[PDB]
Coordinates of C-alpha atoms and ligand atoms in Angstrom, one line a residue:
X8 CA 151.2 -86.4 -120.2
X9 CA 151.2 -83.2 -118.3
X10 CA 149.4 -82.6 -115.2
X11 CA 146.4 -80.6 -113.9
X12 CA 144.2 -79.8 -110.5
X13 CA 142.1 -81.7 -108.8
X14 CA 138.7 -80.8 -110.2
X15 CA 136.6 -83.1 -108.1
X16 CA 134.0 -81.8 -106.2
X17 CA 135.7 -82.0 -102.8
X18 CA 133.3 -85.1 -100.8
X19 CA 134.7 -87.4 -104.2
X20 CA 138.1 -87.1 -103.0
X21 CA 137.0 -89.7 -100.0
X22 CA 134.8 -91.8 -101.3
X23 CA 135.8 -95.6 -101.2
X24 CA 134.5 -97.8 -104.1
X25 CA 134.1 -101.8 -103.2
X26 CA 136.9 -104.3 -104.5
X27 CA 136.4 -106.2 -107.8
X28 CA 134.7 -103.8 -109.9
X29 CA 135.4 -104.8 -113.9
X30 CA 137.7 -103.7 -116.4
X31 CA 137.4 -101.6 -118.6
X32 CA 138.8 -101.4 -122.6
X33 CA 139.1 -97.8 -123.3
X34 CA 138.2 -97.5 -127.2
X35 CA 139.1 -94.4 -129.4
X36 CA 138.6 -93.6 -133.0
X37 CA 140.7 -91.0 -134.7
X38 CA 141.2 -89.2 -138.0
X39 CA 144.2 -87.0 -139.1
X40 CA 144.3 -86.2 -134.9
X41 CA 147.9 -84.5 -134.6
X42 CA 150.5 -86.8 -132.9
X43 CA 150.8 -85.2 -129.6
X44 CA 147.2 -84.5 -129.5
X45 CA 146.5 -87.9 -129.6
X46 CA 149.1 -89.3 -127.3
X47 CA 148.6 -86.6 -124.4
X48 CA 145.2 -88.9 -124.4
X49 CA 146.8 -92.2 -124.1
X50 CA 148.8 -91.2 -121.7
X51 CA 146.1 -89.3 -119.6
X52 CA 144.3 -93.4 -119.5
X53 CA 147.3 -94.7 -118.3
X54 CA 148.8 -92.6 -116.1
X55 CA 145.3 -91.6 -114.7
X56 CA 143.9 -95.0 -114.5
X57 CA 144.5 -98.1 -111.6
X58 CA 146.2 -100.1 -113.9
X59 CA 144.4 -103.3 -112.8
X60 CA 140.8 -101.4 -113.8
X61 CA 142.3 -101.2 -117.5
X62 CA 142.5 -104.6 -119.9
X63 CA 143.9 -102.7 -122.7
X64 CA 143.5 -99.4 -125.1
X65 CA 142.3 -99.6 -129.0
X66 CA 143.0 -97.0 -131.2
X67 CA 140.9 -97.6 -134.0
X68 CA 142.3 -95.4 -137.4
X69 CA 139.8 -94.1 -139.3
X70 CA 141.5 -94.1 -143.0
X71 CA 143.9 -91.4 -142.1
X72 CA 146.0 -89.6 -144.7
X73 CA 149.3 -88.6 -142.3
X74 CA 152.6 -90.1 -142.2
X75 CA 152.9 -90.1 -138.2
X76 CA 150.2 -91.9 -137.6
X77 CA 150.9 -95.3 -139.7
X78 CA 154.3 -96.7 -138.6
X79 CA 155.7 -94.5 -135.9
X80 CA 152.1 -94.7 -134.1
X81 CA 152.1 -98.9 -134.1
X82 CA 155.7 -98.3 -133.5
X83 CA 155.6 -96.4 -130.0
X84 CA 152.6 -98.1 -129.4
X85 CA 153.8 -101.8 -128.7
X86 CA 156.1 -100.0 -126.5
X87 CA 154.4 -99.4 -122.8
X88 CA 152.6 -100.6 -119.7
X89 CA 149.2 -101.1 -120.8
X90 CA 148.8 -103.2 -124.4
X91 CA 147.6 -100.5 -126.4
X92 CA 146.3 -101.9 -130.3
X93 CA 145.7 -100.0 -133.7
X94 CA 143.4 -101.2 -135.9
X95 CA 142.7 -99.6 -139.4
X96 CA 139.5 -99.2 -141.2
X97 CA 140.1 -99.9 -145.0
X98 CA 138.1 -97.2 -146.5
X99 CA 136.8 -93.8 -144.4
X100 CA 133.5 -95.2 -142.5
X101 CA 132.6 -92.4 -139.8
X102 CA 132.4 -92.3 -136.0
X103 CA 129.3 -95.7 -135.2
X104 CA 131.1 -97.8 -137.6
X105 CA 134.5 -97.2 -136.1
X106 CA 133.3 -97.7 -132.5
X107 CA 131.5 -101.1 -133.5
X108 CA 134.4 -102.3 -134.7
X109 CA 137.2 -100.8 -131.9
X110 CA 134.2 -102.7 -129.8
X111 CA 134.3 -106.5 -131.1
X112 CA 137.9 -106.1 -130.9
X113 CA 138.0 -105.2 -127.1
X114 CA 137.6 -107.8 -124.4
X115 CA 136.6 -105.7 -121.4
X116 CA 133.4 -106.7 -119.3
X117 CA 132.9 -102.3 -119.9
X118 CA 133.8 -100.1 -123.2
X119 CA 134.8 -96.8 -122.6
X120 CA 134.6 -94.5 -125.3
X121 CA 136.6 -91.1 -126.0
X122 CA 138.2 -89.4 -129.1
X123 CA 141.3 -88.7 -129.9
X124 CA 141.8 -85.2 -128.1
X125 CA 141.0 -85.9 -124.3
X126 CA 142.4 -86.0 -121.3
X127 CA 141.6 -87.7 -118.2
X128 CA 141.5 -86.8 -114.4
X129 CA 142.7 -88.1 -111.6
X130 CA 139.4 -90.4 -109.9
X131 CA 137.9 -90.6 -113.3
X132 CA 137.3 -93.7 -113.6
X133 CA 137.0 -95.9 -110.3
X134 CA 133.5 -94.3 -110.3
X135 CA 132.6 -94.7 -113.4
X136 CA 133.1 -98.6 -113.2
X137 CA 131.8 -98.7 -109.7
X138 CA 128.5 -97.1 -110.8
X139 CA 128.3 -100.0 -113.9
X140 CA 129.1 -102.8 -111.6
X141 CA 126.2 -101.4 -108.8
X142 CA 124.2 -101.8 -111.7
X143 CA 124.5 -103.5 -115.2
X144 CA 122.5 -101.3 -117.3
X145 CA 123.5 -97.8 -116.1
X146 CA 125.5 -96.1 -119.1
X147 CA 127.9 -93.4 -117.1
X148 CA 129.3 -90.0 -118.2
X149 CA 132.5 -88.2 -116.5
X150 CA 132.0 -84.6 -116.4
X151 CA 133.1 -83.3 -119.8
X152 CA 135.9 -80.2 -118.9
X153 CA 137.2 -78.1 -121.6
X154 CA 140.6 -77.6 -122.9
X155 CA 141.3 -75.0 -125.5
X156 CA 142.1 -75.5 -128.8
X157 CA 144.5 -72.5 -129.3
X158 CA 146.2 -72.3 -125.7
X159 CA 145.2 -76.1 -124.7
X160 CA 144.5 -74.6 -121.2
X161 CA 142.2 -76.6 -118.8
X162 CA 138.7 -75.4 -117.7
X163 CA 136.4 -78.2 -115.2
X164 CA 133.1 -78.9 -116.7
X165 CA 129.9 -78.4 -113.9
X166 CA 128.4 -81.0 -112.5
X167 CA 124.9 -78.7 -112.6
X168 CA 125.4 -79.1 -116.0
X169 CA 123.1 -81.7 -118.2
X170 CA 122.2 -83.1 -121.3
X171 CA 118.6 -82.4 -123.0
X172 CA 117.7 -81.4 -126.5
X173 CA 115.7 -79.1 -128.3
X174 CA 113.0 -79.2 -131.0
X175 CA 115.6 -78.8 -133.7
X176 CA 116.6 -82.3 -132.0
X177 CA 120.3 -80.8 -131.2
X178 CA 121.6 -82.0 -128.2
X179 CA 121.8 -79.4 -125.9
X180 CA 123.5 -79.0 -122.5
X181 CA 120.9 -77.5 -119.7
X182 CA 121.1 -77.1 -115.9
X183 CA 120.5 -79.4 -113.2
X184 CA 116.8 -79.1 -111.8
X185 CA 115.5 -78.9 -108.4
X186 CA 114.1 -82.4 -108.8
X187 CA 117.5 -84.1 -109.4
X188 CA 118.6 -81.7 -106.5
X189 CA 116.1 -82.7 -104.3
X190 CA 116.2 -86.8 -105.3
X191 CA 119.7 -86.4 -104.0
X192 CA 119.3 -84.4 -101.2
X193 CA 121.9 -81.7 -102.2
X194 CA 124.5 -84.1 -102.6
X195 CA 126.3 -83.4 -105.5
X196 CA 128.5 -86.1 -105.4
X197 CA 125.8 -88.4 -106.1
X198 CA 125.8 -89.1 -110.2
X199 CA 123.0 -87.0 -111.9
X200 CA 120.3 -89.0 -114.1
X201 CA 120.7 -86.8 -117.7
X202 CA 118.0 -87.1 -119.9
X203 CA 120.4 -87.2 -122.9
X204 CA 124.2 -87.6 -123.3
X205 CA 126.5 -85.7 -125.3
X206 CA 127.4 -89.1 -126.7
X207 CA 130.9 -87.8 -126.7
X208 CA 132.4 -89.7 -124.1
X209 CA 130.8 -92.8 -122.1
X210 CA 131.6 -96.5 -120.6
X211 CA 129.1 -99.2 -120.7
X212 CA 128.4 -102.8 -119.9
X213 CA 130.2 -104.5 -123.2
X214 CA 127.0 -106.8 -123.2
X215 CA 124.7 -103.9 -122.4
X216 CA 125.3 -102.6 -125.6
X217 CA 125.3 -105.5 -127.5
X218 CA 121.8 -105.8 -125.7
X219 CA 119.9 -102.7 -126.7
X220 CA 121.2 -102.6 -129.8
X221 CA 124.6 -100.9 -129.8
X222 CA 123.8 -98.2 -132.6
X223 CA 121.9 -98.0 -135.8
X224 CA 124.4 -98.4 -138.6
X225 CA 121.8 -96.9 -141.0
X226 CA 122.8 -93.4 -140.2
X227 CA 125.3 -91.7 -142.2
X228 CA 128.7 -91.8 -141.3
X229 CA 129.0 -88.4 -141.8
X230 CA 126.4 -87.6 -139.1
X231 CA 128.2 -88.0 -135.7
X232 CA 126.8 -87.8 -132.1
X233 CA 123.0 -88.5 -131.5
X234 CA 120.2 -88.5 -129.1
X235 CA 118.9 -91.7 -130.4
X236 CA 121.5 -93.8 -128.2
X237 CA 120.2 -91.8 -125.0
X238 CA 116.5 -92.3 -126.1
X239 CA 116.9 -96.0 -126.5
X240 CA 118.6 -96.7 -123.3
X241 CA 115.9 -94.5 -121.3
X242 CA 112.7 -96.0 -123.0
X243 CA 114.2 -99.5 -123.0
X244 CA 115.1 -100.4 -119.3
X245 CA 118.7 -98.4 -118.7
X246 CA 119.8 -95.3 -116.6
X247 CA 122.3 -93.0 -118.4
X248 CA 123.9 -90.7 -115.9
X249 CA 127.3 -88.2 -115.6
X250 CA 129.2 -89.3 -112.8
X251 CA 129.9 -86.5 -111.0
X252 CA 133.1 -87.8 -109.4
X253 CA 134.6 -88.5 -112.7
X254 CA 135.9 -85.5 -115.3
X255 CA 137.8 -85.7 -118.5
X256 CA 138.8 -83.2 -120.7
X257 CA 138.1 -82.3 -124.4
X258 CA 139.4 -80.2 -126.7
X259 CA 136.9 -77.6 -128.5
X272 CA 122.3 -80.5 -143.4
X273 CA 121.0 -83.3 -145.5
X274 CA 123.2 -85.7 -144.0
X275 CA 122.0 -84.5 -140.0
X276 CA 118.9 -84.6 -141.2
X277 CA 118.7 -88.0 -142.1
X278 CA 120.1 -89.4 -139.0
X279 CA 117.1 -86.9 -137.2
X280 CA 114.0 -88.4 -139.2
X281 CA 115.9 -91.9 -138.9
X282 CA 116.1 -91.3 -134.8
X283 CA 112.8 -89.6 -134.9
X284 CA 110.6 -91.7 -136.7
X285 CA 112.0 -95.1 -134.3
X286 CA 111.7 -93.6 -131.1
X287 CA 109.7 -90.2 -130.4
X288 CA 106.2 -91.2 -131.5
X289 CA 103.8 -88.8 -132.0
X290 CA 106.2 -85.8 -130.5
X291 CA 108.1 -86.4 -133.7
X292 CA 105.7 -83.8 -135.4
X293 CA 107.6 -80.8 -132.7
X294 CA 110.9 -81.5 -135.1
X295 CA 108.4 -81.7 -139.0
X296 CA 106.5 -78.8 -138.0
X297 CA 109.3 -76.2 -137.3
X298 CA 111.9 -77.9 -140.3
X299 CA 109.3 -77.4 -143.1
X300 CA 110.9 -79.7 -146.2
X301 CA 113.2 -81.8 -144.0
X302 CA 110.5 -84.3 -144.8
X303 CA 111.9 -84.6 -149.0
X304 CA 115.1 -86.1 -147.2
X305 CA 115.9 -89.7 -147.7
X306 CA 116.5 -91.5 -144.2
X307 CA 116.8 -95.3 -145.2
X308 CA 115.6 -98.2 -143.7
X309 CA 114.5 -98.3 -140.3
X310 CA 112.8 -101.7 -140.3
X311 CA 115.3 -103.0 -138.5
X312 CA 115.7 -100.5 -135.9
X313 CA 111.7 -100.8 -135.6
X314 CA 112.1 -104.3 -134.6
X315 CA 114.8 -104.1 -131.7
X316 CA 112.3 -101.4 -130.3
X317 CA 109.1 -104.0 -130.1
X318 CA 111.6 -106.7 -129.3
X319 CA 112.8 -105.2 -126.1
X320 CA 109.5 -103.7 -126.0
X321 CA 110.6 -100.2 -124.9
X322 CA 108.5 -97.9 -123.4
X323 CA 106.5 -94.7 -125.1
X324 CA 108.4 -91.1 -125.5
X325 CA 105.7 -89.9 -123.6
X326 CA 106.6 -92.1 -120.3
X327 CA 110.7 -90.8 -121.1
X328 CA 109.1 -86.9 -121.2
X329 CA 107.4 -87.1 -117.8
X330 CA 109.6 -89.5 -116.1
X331 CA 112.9 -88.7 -116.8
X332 CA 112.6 -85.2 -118.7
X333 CA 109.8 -83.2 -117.0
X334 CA 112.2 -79.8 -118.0
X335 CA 111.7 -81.2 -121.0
X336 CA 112.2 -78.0 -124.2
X337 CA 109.1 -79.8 -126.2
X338 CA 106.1 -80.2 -123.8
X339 CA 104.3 -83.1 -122.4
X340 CA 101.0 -81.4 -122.7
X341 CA 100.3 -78.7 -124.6
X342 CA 97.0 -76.9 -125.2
X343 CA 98.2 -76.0 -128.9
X344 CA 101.4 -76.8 -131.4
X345 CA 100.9 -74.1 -134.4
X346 CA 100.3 -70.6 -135.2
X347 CA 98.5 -67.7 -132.5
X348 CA 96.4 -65.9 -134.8
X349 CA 95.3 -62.3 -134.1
X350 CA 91.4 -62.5 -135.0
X351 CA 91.3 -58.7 -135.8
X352 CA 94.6 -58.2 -138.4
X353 CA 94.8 -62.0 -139.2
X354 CA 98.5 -61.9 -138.4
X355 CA 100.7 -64.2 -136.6
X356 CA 103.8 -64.4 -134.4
X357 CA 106.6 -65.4 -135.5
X358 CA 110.5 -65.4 -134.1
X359 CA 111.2 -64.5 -137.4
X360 CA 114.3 -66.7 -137.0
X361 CA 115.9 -64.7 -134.1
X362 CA 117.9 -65.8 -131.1
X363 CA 117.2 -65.7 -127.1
X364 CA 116.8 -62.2 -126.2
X365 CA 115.1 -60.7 -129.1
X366 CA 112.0 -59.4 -130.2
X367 CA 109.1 -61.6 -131.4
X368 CA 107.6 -60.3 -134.6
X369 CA 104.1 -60.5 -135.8
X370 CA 103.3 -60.8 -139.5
X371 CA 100.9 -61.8 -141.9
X372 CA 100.2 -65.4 -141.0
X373 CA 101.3 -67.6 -144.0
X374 CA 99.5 -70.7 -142.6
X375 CA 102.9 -72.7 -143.5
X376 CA 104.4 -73.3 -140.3
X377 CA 107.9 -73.1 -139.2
X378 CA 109.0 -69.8 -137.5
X379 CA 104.7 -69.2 -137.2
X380 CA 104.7 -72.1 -135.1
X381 CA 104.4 -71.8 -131.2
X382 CA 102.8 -73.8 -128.6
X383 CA 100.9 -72.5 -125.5
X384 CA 102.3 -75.2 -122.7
X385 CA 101.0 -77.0 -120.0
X386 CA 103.2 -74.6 -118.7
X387 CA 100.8 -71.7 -119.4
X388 CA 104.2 -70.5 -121.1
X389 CA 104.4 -69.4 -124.9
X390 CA 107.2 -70.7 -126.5
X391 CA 108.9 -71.5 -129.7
X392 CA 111.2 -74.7 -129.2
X393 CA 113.6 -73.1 -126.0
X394 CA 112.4 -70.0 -126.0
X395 CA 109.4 -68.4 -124.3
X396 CA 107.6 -65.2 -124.1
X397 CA 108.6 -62.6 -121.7
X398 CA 107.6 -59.5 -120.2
X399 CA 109.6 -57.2 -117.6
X400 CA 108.0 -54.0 -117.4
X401 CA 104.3 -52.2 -118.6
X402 CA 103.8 -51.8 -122.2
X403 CA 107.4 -53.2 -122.3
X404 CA 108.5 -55.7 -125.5
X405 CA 107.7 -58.8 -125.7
X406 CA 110.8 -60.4 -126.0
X407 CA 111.8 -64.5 -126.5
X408 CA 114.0 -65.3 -123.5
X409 CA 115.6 -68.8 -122.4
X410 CA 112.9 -70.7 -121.0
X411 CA 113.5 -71.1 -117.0
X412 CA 110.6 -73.7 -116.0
X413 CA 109.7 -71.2 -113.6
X414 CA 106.6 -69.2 -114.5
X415 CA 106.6 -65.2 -113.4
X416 CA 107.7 -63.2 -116.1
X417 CA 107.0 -66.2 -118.6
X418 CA 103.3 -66.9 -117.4
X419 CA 100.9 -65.8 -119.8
X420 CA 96.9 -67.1 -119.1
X421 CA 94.6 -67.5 -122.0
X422 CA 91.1 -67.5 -121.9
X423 CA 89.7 -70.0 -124.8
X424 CA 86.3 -68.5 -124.9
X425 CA 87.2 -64.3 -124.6
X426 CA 90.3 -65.7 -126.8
X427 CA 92.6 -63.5 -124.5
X428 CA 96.0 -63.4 -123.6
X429 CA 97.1 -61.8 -120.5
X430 CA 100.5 -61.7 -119.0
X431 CA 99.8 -62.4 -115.4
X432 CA 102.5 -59.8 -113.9
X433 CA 102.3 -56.9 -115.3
X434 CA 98.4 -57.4 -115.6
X435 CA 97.9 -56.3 -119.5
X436 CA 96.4 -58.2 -122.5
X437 CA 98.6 -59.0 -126.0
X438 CA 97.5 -57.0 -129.4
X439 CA 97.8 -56.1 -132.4
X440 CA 101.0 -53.9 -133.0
X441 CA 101.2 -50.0 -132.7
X442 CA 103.0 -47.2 -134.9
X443 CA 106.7 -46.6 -135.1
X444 CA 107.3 -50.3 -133.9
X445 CA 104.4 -51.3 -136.7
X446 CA 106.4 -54.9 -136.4
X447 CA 106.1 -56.4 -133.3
X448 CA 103.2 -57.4 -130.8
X449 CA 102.5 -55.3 -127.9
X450 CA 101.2 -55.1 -124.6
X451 CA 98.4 -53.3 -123.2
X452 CA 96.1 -52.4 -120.7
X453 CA 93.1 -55.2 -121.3
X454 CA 90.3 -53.6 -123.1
X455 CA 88.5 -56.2 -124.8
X456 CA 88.8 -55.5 -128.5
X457 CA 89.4 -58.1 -131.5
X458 CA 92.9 -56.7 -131.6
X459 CA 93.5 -58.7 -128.0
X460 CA 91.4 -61.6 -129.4
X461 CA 94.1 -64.7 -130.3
X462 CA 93.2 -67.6 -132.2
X463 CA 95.8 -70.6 -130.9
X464 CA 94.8 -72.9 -133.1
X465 CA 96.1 -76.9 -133.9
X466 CA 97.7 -77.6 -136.9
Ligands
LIG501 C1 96.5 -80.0 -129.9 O1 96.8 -81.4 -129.8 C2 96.9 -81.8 -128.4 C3 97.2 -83.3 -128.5 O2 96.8 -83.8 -129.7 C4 95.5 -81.6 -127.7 O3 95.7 -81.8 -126.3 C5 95.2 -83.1 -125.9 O4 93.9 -82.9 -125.4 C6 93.3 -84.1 -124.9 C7 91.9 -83.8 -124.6 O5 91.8 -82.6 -123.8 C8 94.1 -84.6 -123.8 O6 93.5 -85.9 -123.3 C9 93.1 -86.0 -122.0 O7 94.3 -86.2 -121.2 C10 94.1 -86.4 -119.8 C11 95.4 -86.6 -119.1 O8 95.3 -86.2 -117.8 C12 93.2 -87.7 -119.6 O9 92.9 -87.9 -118.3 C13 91.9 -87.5 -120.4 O10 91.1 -88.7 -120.4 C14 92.1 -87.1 -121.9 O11 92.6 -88.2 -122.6 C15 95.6 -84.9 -124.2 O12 96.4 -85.2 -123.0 C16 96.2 -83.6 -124.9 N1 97.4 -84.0 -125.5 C17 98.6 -83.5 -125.1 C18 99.8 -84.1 -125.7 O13 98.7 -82.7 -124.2 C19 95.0 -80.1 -127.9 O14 93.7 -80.1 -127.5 C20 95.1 -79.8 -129.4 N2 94.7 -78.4 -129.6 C21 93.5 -78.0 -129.4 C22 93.1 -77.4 -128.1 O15 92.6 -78.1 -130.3
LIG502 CA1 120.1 -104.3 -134.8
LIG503 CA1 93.2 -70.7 -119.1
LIG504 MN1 135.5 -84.6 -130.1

């Protein structure tokens, strides 16, 4: 234990939470986690915590290999405040399997999870537990702050700061909206509804989760965090939201594509095609059984990715509605755009369009925006580049208006057409004054 600043928002710092609210068995899993590392957290719980809101702390061992952490660790365990246990997993089994079993063993009426390298705040969690016991099925998130893993030094999290995800189903963290900003009427102490979590750290109802499932043990253990517990608790009854009163601190192929098609193919319907169509070949990867998994969903009878997108996700990275998922075909050269693989900021490429997909793929949104998974199109000056920028969801610079009979595509502010690419820069699209030749003619066609 050491100490830091208050990093509440400053309104949190009065707030009084009603009498009674449940307690709470903090559950960690670790592996190899250096000593001190690992008992600046336990310490953080206790010290940080009302020691009534606490029944007890697990430590759950996941087949470590050092010295310190057999012995000694029991040892200077037994000894303080709050009963803290170790339990020890036989043979190395991966983060699910060590939380479901750090889980039966607790006896809280709410599991909180961490790792093994955090540290708490002061507040964090009398609104966390006050949230669950308003209501039952609400899973709650502390604002994650970051410590460094060289200097250790302390840095407080946002609480504009959300989860989402993007086509590549990588959680993602995004900004706050207007919507949640307006629901709350600029009160930012009021916990945020985030469409995903970053499954990191998080308390819920011990038979909430037990109730929608807990998690799907047919991943890989070698996987980690998902979206697939955040899709399951919007689309079957819950509310997952970051508390914004509460912030704790964290230190900073195959195999994640299995746990993908596994999450995928249970919960995201037909929008499951935004993750094959760009990951061309993911589909020769083995993800198991999901019979099971299949069943809980029509048992609880959750609702349709769809209702989840519009609902609780309208910022959504992979669109609602779209007027086309696939490749934008110029009718005169026959080539396509693609992002040629390259990051926010850069140029988007034309070539030769391959018909196979993947970095050909874009989709003209709802939106009237042309993107490629979280990046869009975007134009800041005449005849300037067409470059892929972060995709704000508002419009301007991002607004491009097709025309599916003249098969043009105009970029509303500067007030020029898209073709075919011109000399010296022979490999990129440009934009021009509209004349109305095949080379401004695009083909946004469906897969
Ligand atoms: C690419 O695929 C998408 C979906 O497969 C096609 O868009 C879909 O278009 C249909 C018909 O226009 C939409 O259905 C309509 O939806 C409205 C909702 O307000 C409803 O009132 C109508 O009765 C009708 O059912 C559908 O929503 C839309 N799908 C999505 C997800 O946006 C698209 O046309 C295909 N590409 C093309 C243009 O060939
Ligand atoms: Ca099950
Ligand atoms: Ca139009
Ligand atoms: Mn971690």
């Amino acid at each position: 234990n050491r100490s830091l600043p208050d990093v509440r928002l400053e309104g949190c710092k009065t707030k009084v939470y009603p009498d009674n609210l449940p307690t709470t068995s903090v559950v960690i899993v670790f592996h190899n986690e250096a000593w001190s590392t690992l008992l600046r957290t336990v310490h953080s719980v206790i010290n940080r915590s009302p020691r009534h809101m606490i029944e007890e702390i697990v430590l759950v061992d996941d087949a470590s290999e050092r010295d310190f952490l057999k012995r000694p660790l029991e040892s200077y365990v037994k000894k303080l405040k709050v009963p803290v246990h170790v339990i020890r997993m036989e043979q190395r089994s991966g983060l699910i399997r060590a939380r479901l079993k750090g889980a039966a063993v607790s006896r809280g009426q709410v599991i909180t999870f961490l790792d093994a390298h955090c540290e708490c705040t002061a507040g964090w969690l009398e609104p966390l537990l006050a949230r669950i016991k308003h209501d039952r099925r609400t899973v709650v998130c502390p604002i994650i702050d970051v410590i460094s893993d060289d200097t250790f030094e302390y840095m407080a999290g946002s609480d504009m700061t959300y989860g989402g995800f993007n086509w590549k189903l990588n959680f993602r963290w995004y900004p706050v909206p207007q919507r949640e900003m307006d629901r709350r009427k600029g009160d930012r102490t009021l916990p945020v509804r985030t469409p995903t979590m970053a499954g990191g750290l998080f308390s819920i109802d011990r038979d909430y989760f037990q109730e929608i499932g807990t998690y799907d043990a047919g991943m890989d253990i070698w996987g980690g965090e998902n979206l697939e517990i955040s899709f399951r608790i919007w689309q079957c009854g819950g509310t997952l939201e970051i508390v914004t009163c509460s912030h704790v601190g964290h230190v900073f192929g195959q195999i994640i594509n299995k746990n993908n098609r596994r999450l995928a193919e249970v919960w995201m319907d037909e929008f499951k095609n935004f993750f094959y169509i760009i990951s061309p070949g993911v589909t020769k990867v083995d993800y198991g059984d999901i019979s099971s998994r299949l069943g809980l969903r029509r048992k609880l009878q959750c609702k349709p990715f769809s209702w989840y997108l519009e609902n609780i996700y309208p910022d959504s990275q992979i669109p609602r509605h779209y007027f086309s998922l696939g490749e934008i075909r110029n009718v005169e050269t026959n080539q396509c755009l693609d992002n040629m693989a390259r990051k926010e900021n850069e140029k988007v490429g034309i070539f030769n369009c391959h018909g196979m997909g993947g970095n050909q793929v874009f989709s003209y949104t709802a939106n009237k925006e042309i993107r490629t998974d979280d990046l869009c199109l975007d134009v800041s000056k005449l005849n300037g580049p067409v470059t892929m920028l972060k995709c704000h969801h508002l419009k301007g610079n991002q607004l491009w208006e097709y025309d599916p009979v003249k098969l043009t595509l105009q970029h509303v502010n500067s007030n020029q057409c898209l073709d075919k690419a011109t000399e010296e820069d022979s490999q990129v699209p440009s934009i021009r004054d509209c004349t109305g030749s095949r080379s401004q003619q695009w083909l946004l066609r469906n897969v």
